[PDB]
Amino acid sequence: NTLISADLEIFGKVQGVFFRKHMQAEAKKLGVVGWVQNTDRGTVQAQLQGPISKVRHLQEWAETRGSPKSHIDKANFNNEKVILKLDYSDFQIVK
Numbered sequence: 001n002t003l004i005s006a007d008l009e010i011f012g013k014v015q016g017v018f019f020r021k022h023m024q025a026e027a028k029k030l031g032v033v034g035w036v037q038n039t040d041r042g043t044v045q046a047q048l049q050g051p052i053s054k055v056r057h058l059q060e061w062a063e064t065r066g067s068p069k070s071h072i073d074k075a076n077f078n079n080e081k082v083i084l085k086l087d088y089s090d091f092q093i094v095k
Helices: 021-032 051-067
Strands: 003-013 035-039 044-051 071-082 091-092
Touching: 003 091, 021 035, 021 044, 021 051, 021 091, 044 051, 051 071
Parallel strands: 035 091
Antiparallel strands: 003 044, 003 071, 035 044
16 A cells, blocks of 8 residues: 655664664565665664555664664664655665
Protein backbone atom coordinates (compact mmCIF):
# COMPACT_ATOMS: atom_id res chain seq x y z
CA ASN A 1 0.00 0.00 0.00
CA THR A 2 1.56 3.28 1.15
CA LEU A 3 5.22 3.60 0.18
CA ILE A 4 7.56 6.02 1.92
CA SER A 5 11.15 7.24 1.63
CA ALA A 6 12.99 8.35 4.78
CA ASP A 7 16.55 9.24 5.81
CA LEU A 8 18.37 8.28 8.97
CA GLU A 9 21.63 8.73 10.81
CA ILE A 10 22.72 6.65 13.78
CA PHE A 11 25.26 7.83 16.36
CA GLY A 12 27.36 5.93 18.90
CA LYS A 13 29.60 2.90 18.59
CA VAL A 14 28.19 2.07 15.17
CA GLN A 15 31.18 1.47 12.87
CA GLY A 16 33.44 -1.60 12.84
CA VAL A 17 30.68 -3.74 14.30
CA PHE A 18 28.91 -5.21 11.24
CA PHE A 19 26.17 -2.55 11.49
CA ARG A 20 25.90 -2.17 7.68
CA LYS A 21 25.79 -5.94 7.11
CA HIS A 22 23.12 -6.45 9.77
CA MET A 23 21.04 -3.49 8.62
CA GLN A 24 21.16 -4.80 5.05
CA ALA A 25 20.13 -8.30 6.18
CA GLU A 26 17.15 -6.94 8.13
CA ALA A 27 16.13 -4.64 5.23
CA LYS A 28 16.19 -7.56 2.78
CA LYS A 29 14.00 -9.70 5.07
CA LEU A 30 11.59 -6.75 5.47
CA GLY A 31 11.51 -5.84 1.77
CA VAL A 32 13.02 -2.40 2.42
CA VAL A 33 15.26 -0.93 -0.31
CA GLY A 34 17.80 1.91 -0.39
CA TRP A 35 21.35 2.16 0.96
CA VAL A 36 23.47 2.38 4.07
CA GLN A 37 26.86 4.05 4.43
CA ASN A 38 29.58 4.73 7.00
CA THR A 39 30.36 8.45 7.27
CA ASP A 40 33.76 9.99 8.00
CA ARG A 41 32.23 11.32 11.23
CA GLY A 42 31.86 7.90 12.85
CA THR A 43 28.11 7.71 12.17
CA VAL A 44 25.92 5.55 9.96
CA GLN A 45 23.66 7.12 7.32
CA ALA A 46 20.94 5.45 5.29
CA GLN A 47 18.00 6.05 2.98
CA LEU A 48 15.06 3.65 3.33
CA GLN A 49 12.17 3.08 0.93
CA GLY A 50 9.27 0.66 1.07
CA PRO A 51 5.84 -0.02 2.57
CA ILE A 52 5.52 2.20 5.65
CA SER A 53 5.10 -0.82 7.97
CA LYS A 54 8.36 -2.38 6.78
CA VAL A 55 10.28 0.91 6.92
CA ARG A 56 9.01 1.47 10.49
CA HIS A 57 10.29 -2.00 11.51
CA LEU A 58 13.72 -1.23 10.06
CA GLN A 59 13.78 2.19 11.71
CA GLU A 60 13.03 0.52 15.04
CA TRP A 61 15.87 -1.94 14.38
CA ALA A 62 18.29 0.94 13.61
CA GLU A 63 17.38 2.93 16.71
CA THR A 64 17.14 0.22 19.36
CA ARG A 65 18.68 -3.06 18.11
CA GLY A 66 21.58 -2.58 15.67
CA SER A 67 24.27 -5.24 15.48
CA PRO A 68 25.30 -7.17 18.61
CA LYS A 69 28.48 -5.13 19.31
CA SER A 70 27.01 -1.75 18.33
CA HIS A 71 25.93 0.75 20.93
CA ILE A 72 23.40 3.31 19.71
CA ASP A 73 23.54 6.72 21.39
CA LYS A 74 21.01 8.39 19.13
CA ALA A 75 19.05 7.95 15.91
CA ASN A 76 17.89 10.87 13.75
CA PHE A 77 15.10 10.44 11.20
CA ASN A 78 14.16 13.02 8.60
CA ASN A 79 13.08 13.86 5.06
CA GLU A 80 10.21 11.39 5.10
CA LYS A 81 7.89 11.61 2.11
CA VAL A 82 5.19 9.51 0.51
CA ILE A 83 6.34 8.10 -2.83
CA LEU A 84 4.43 6.38 -5.64
CA LYS A 85 7.18 3.98 -6.59
CA LEU A 86 10.53 2.80 -5.28
CA ASP A 87 13.76 4.37 -6.61
CA TYR A 88 15.87 1.34 -5.62
CA SER A 89 15.71 -2.34 -6.50
CA ASP A 90 17.30 -3.54 -3.26
CA PHE A 91 19.26 -2.47 -0.16
CA GLN A 92 22.94 -1.71 -0.87
CA ILE A 93 25.94 -1.15 1.37
CA VAL A 94 27.63 1.84 -0.29
CA LYS A 95 31.09 3.39 0.07
